Ligand binder design. Structure first.
Ligand code: J05
Ligand code: NA
Length: 240
């Protein structure tokens, strides 16, 4: 997250860190959202490489154990069957990870609330991105979870020629693009939390940023639109 601030400890208790084994240790690669005690929602592109993954729930400071974390293996990966790693812009950038055990819920570990199927937010709706992704273009990961206010940019604007044009689809949510605040590498897979009827719900899964930079005017961060996938998510959970 570029242009963010440090989140209060576990104010985003459904945020997870998706990590892969790197030698004798672990490396953060993506965010995700805990949606059942044994299921995480992330981006399909986060699992394009065949690696050993783990999920950390209750995380805040990646470099230090604070007593709130639970670490769990990934037992099954279900990528959307229409995902094409060579065509991010086609969409379908979503995957579900079945965890090797069910995590315990507490003040630090909670299920993320999903929107009702089909929900489209009005332009400029209030949302926050969260993650441990880079804090500047070409920079380094955040040690502690960051948040940034990233209001939505509706499809008509986001898919116009001076923004992302045809690359953005109606199955995506765009947010930000002010040139100061944005998602960045390693926020991918994580949530966009948007306030609806007084409750935050996870409307986006971070999918891509501009190759020109993370915080780039009229290149808002692009998210898979969770509300387009409610039936798919429920079908996967019900059949696994
Ligand atoms: S996201 O918008 O943050 C973005 C820029 C697409 C991103 O940084 N995604 C992170 C990501 C994770 N993976 C899979 C992967 C690739 C290589 C290794 Br060594 C490990 C994991 N690809 N992009
Ligand atoms: Na920690």
């Amino acid at each position: 997250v570029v242009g963010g601030t440090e989140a209060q400890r576990n104010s985003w208790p459904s945020q997870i860190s998706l990590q892969y084994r790197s030698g004798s240790s672990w490396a953060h690669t993506c965010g995700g959202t805990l949606i059942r005690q044994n299921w995480v929602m992330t981006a399909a592109h986060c699992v394009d490489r065949e690696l050993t993954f783990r999920v950390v729930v209750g995380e805040h400071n990646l470099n230090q154990n604070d007593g709130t974390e639970q670490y769990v293996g990934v037992q099954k990966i279900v990528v959307h069957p229409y995902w094409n790693t060579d065509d991010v812009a086609a969409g379908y950038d979503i995957a579900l990870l079945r965890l090797a055990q069910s995590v315990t819920l507490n003040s630090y570990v909670q299920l993320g609330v999903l929107p009702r199927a089909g929900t489209i937010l009005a332009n400029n709706s209030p949302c926050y991105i969260t993650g441990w992704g880079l804090t500047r273009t070409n920079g380094q990961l955040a040690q502690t979870l960051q948040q940034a206010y990233l209001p939505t940019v509706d499809y008509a604007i986001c898919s116009s020629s001076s923004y992302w044009g045809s690359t953005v689809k109606n199955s995506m949510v765009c947010a930000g693009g002010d040139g100061v605040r944005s998602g960045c590498q390693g926020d991918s897979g994580g949530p966009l939390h948007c306030l609806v009827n007084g409750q935050y719900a996870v409307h986006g899964v971070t999918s891509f940023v501009s190759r020109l930079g993370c915080n780039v005017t009229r290149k808002p961060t692009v998210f898979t639109r969770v509300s387009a996938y409610i039936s798919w998510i429920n079908n996967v959970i019900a059949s696994n």
